[PDB]
Enzyme design. Structure first.
Site, PDB file in Angstrom:
ATOM      1  N   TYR A   1       0.820  -1.209   0.000  1.00  0.00           N
ATOM      2  CA  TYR A   1       0.000   0.000   0.000  1.00  0.00           C
ATOM      3  C   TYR A   1       0.852   1.256   0.000  1.00  0.00           C
ATOM      4  O   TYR A   1       0.542   2.238   0.663  1.00  0.00           O
ATOM      5  CB  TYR A   1      -0.940  -0.024   1.207  1.00  0.00           C
TER       6      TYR A   1
ATOM      7  N   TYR B   1     -13.503  -5.994   4.898  1.00  0.00           N
ATOM      8  CA  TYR B   1     -12.290  -6.172   4.107  1.00  0.00           C
ATOM      9  C   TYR B   1     -12.101  -7.641   3.812  1.00  0.00           C
ATOM     10  O   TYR B   1     -12.193  -8.488   4.704  1.00  0.00           O
ATOM     11  CB  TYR B   1     -11.051  -5.612   4.816  1.00  0.00           C
TER      12      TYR B   1
ATOM     13  N   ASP C   1     -15.714 -15.074   6.134  1.00  0.00           N
ATOM     14  CA  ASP C   1     -14.296 -14.857   5.929  1.00  0.00           C
ATOM     15  C   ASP C   1     -13.576 -14.861   7.277  1.00  0.00           C
ATOM     16  O   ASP C   1     -13.585 -13.853   7.983  1.00  0.00           O
ATOM     17  CB  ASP C   1     -14.078 -13.532   5.196  1.00  0.00           C
TER      18      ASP C   1
ATOM     19  N   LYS D   1      -4.321 -16.589   7.139  1.00  0.00           N
ATOM     20  CA  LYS D   1      -3.217 -16.022   7.906  1.00  0.00           C
ATOM     21  C   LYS D   1      -2.512 -16.910   8.946  1.00  0.00           C
ATOM     22  O   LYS D   1      -1.326 -17.171   8.806  1.00  0.00           O
ATOM     23  CB  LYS D   1      -3.708 -14.737   8.570  1.00  0.00           C
TER      24      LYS D   1
HETATM   25  C1  LIG Z   1      -5.769 -10.659   5.330  1.00  0.00           C
HETATM   26  C2  LIG Z   1      -7.173 -10.926   4.880  1.00  0.00           C
HETATM   27  C3  LIG Z   1      -7.586 -11.344   3.520  1.00  0.00           C
HETATM   28  C4  LIG Z   1      -6.593 -11.474   2.388  1.00  0.00           C
HETATM   29  O1  LIG Z   1      -5.481 -12.305   2.637  1.00  0.00           O
HETATM   30  P1  LIG Z   1      -4.123 -12.114   1.804  1.00  0.00           P
HETATM   31  O2  LIG Z   1      -3.299 -13.297   2.258  1.00  0.00           O
HETATM   32  O3  LIG Z   1      -3.582 -10.769   2.224  1.00  0.00           O
HETATM   33  O4  LIG Z   1      -4.502 -12.213   0.339  1.00  0.00           O
HETATM   34  C5  LIG Z   1      -8.938 -11.561   3.276  1.00  0.00           C
HETATM   35  N1  LIG Z   1      -9.892 -11.420   4.226  1.00  0.00           N
HETATM   36  C6  LIG Z   1      -9.629 -11.040   5.503  1.00  0.00           C
HETATM   37  C7  LIG Z   1     -10.732 -10.889   6.535  1.00  0.00           C
HETATM   38  C8  LIG Z   1      -8.234 -10.772   5.891  1.00  0.00           C
HETATM   39  O5  LIG Z   1      -7.912 -10.377   7.147  1.00  0.00           O
HETATM   40  O1  LIG Z   2      -4.253  -7.926   8.433  1.00  0.00           O
HETATM   41  C1  LIG Z   2      -4.144  -6.763   8.063  1.00  0.00           C
HETATM   42  C2  LIG Z   2      -4.614  -5.722   8.869  1.00  0.00           C
HETATM   43  C3  LIG Z   2      -5.558  -6.047   9.841  1.00  0.00           C
HETATM   44  C4  LIG Z   2      -6.104  -5.056  10.635  1.00  0.00           C
HETATM   45  C5  LIG Z   2      -5.726  -3.738  10.411  1.00  0.00           C
HETATM   46  C6  LIG Z   2      -4.824  -3.386   9.417  1.00  0.00           C
HETATM   47  C7  LIG Z   2      -4.303  -4.391   8.611  1.00  0.00           C
HETATM   48  C8  LIG Z   2      -3.396  -6.387   6.767  1.00  0.00           C
HETATM   49  C9  LIG Z   2      -4.402  -5.920   5.732  1.00  0.00           C
HETATM   50  C10 LIG Z   2      -3.643  -5.546   4.454  1.00  0.00           C
HETATM   51  N1  LIG Z   2      -2.912  -6.704   3.916  1.00  0.00           N
HETATM   52  C11 LIG Z   2      -1.926  -7.180   4.920  1.00  0.00           C
HETATM   53  C12 LIG Z   2      -2.647  -7.596   6.195  1.00  0.00           C
END
Ligand SMILES: *Cc1c(COP(=O)(O)O)cnc(C)c1O
Ligand SMILES: O=C(c1ccccc1)C1CCNCC1
Ligand SMILES: *Cc1c(COP(=O)(O)O)cnc(C)c1O
Ligand SMILES: O=C(c1ccccc1)C1CCNCC1
Lengths: 429, 429
Positions: free
Chosen positions: A18, A150, A247, A276
């Site tokens: 970002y 998100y 999710d 994750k």
């Molecule tokens: C981090 C995240 C994603 C995307 O995962 P990436 O490995 O960064 O592609 C999708 N949904 C949620 C709720 C997340 O925290």
């Molecule tokens: O897990 C994340 C996060 C979660 C809460 C607040 C800010 C970023 C990132 C979100 C953007 N891609 C890397 C991980």
């Protein structure tokens, strides 16, 4: 490469998350080691030990370089690094699928492995779309969610990101146009559920699925909501024949105080995404689970197959370390551990409530959040945290932490103390 | 722990495979229990047998499985730092790999964005292109153009530039972005094709962000080859009409076609480039998207001011470290001669197939060999036939094809081609 050489190469050639090239106010810090809950970072030419309060963005639930996970990886490396999953299967994939089917919400019986959370969300959408085409209802094409969400950075995932305040807001004109309910409130209010249902009702014939983060919304603002809303969502989706997708890429594997956040409401979705913390923070891996009914309807359809198949699908190395990570989690009293972490975060962050720039303090399992009345300036926050032996990564107006589960009470105290001091600095110039 | 029998049971009940069904696949997956060098150990009728990985596990295993130098690089990194978040931190593996990639890729590509898979790297490339033109005040430039017969991954934007038939766009009518498709690029060079391509592109230039193609070899869309001079024409057309050029070298990269990158056959540099499959030598999922200095700063100077993408496991130290070792291992040998010998062995071995009744073409490009038949290849027949001959093959549609590990001996290439010829013999009866 020396740390100074790394910095030079990084400035010239490396895109960071970002970010821009050549226009970041605050430069990346060189990390040179990680062990347990600690990172070794280079500051002013010297090595310093700091706590990984972020668990490296939710991933390092057992800390770095855990002996059980290290050995699971080296053990698998000795036997088979990787084989293609087209026409072949293997023990790490089967062991992991068995584990995941057993510990996720009831009814999730099939597992599609991919390489990242964003891809797992696209797979979940594809499952839902193909499901309804298999039912002979291809008009059920759209997704519905609530604001504040998100779900990743690929283009379908972006389409259910919060459209007015989400990080992908500038792309709305080129994304698929989805259905958004208002921000889900923290406290339970039956009127919100009633309105959600009324909105879903008028779109039901064009909706494939509701997609939400359960209990905790992460990158959209670290907001918590009452689990009872998930019960209402399940009921609503059941009655209007709309699939329910959770999710849990951030919330999974104990983080919110239950094994999965869905468990706080005793609810099972039709489709679920994890990632994750799946590999304990060693390697990229994600998974999308769905019910036998969803799988069979897809498999009986015109396609007769789910049309997705990543090159490194079900990678044996990532699967083997994931198996070890999940087993390590389940073989200990993780619930007591997380309850203790939550107590430590609550007690440590309590004095932030009185600070002039602090609008809210909230904790949910091993997640601690100080919400400030202004965006947090990383140029001020990052050295303040480092001075106190803690790595923090604020975002927007939030100073937040999701520590490794192996953190001792003294370590949680050191983390909450740094967070408070960061918040204090926010409110004084 | 699981026996091969228990693995099959778990697999059939709980595991999705690439582009497959649950519970309806005619050919059950074969259990893989080990992989070393060019060889897989597979379970056939309860017995472990060693067979050649003629597919390099889908392009990945270019140095073979369990190569000592790559195993070593992984375990070395594992002892110091498994992973840290790339948000605000950097590290030696990311810097070393970035430096390597900018050095060996076509001239002008000097910034690197790491992601977790090829499909994601393609979406990053698209996002770079779209954000580029937003940065130039031309947000109308938002469509992509490609030629038919292509493949770029399985996420929804990647699907939109896949061959309409190959990616079964039939199933995804207006789910997918509607992109601009030129006709199938011919094998032999015909200037009239390029002139027609130009005329079509010219009509769309004001709404086109980028042309996206696989250079020289089209992989999953049909294993087709085309004259490198077409890439020379694309570069010229794109320059004259102000459309960016993206090369997807996720399958062609790192020596596979006889050049370090396929673009080098034409002596052209794209504005943006994707790499992936063989980047880590086949150990772990990793991909990267490179772009020019112009592309990077135009993005960074735009109103948006940042490329809003950032995978959780971005620039994973373990994956980067094995990639560095894989790339250095490739560069530290006479890889050009190795590929030429491989190509000669494929040519000699496959020549017998030309005269077969069901065979319409035989073609070789670098370490890639293809037998194209006049009808679908039956997996139920082809797979035990190849396994009987000590070779793992994965035919697709009407193609019997291979991309062997670079470490394969002349004797092993003879074994591989003879299995291919015999599969191509069984089809036409
Ligand atoms: C981090 C995240 C994603 C995307 O995962 P990436 O490995 O960064 O592609 C999708 N949904 C949620 C709720 C997340 O925290
Ligand atoms: O897990 C994340 C996060 C979660 C809460 C607040 C800010 C970023 C990132 C979100 C953007 N891609 C890397 C991980
Ligand atoms: C394999 C491939 C992709 C997608 O890579 P995944 O790792 O499967 O997402 C994209 N483009 C081309 C040319 C490929 O060969
Ligand atoms: O590389 C591929 C390929 C190449 C040629 C023919 C069929 C599949 C696969 C395409 C689907 N995803 C896994 C890799």
């Amino acid at each position: 490469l020396t740390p100074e050489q790394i910095i030079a190469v990084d400035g010239a050639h490396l895109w960071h998350p970002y970010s821009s090239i050549g226009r970041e106010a605050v430069s990346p810090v060189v990390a040179v080691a990680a062990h347990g809950a600690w990172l070794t970072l280079i500051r002013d030419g010297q090595p310093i030990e700091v706590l990984d309060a972020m668990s490296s963005w939710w991933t390092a639930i057992h800390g770095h370089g855990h002996p059980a996970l290290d050995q699971a990886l080296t053990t698998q490396l000795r036997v088979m690094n990787h084989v293609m999953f087209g026409g072949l299967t293997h023990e790490p994939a089967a062991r992991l699928a068995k584990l995941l089917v057993d510990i996720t919400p009831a009814g999730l019986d099939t597992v599609f492995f991919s390489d990242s959370g964003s891809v797992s969300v696209e797979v979940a959408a594809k499952m839902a779309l193909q499901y309804w085409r298999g039912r002979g209802l291809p008009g059920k094409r759209r997704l519905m969610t609530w604001r504040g969400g998100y779900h990743g950075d690929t283009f379908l995932a972006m389409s259910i990101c919060d459209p007015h305040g989400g990080m992908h807001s500038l792309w709305t004109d080129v994304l698929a146009a989805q259905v958004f309910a208002p921000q889900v409130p923290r406290d339970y209010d039956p009127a919100y559920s009633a309105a959600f249902e009324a909105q879903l009702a008028q779109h039901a014939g064009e909706l494939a699925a509701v997609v939400v983060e359960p209990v905790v919304q992460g990158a959209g603002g670290m907001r918590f909501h009452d689990p009872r809303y998930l019960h209402d969502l399940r009921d609503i989706c059941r009655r209007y024949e709309v699939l329910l997708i959770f999710d849990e890429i951030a919330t999974g594997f104990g983080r919110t105080g239950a094994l999965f956040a869905a468990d706080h409401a005793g609810v099972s979705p039709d489709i679920m995404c994890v990632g994750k913390a799946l590999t304990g923070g060693y390697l990229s891996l994600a998974a999308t689970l769905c019910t036998a009914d969803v799988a069979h309807t897809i498999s009986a359809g015109a396609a007769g197959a789910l049309m997705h198949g990543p090159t490194f699908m079900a990678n044996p190395l990532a699967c083997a370390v994931s198996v070890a990570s999940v087993e390590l989690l389940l073989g200990q009293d993780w619930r007591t551990r997380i309850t203790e972490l939550a107590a430590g975060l609550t007690a440590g962050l309590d004095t932030a409530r009185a600070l002039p720039a602090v609008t809210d303090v909230r904790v949910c399992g091993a997640i601690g959040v100080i919400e400030c009345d202004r965006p947090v300036d990383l140029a001020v926050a990052t050295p303040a945290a480092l001075d106190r032996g803690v790595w923090l990564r604020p975002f927007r107006n939030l100073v937040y932490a999701m520590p490794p589960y192996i953190c001792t009470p003294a370590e949680i105290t050191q983390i909450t103390s740094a967070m408070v001091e960061v918040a204090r600095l926010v409110g004084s110039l």
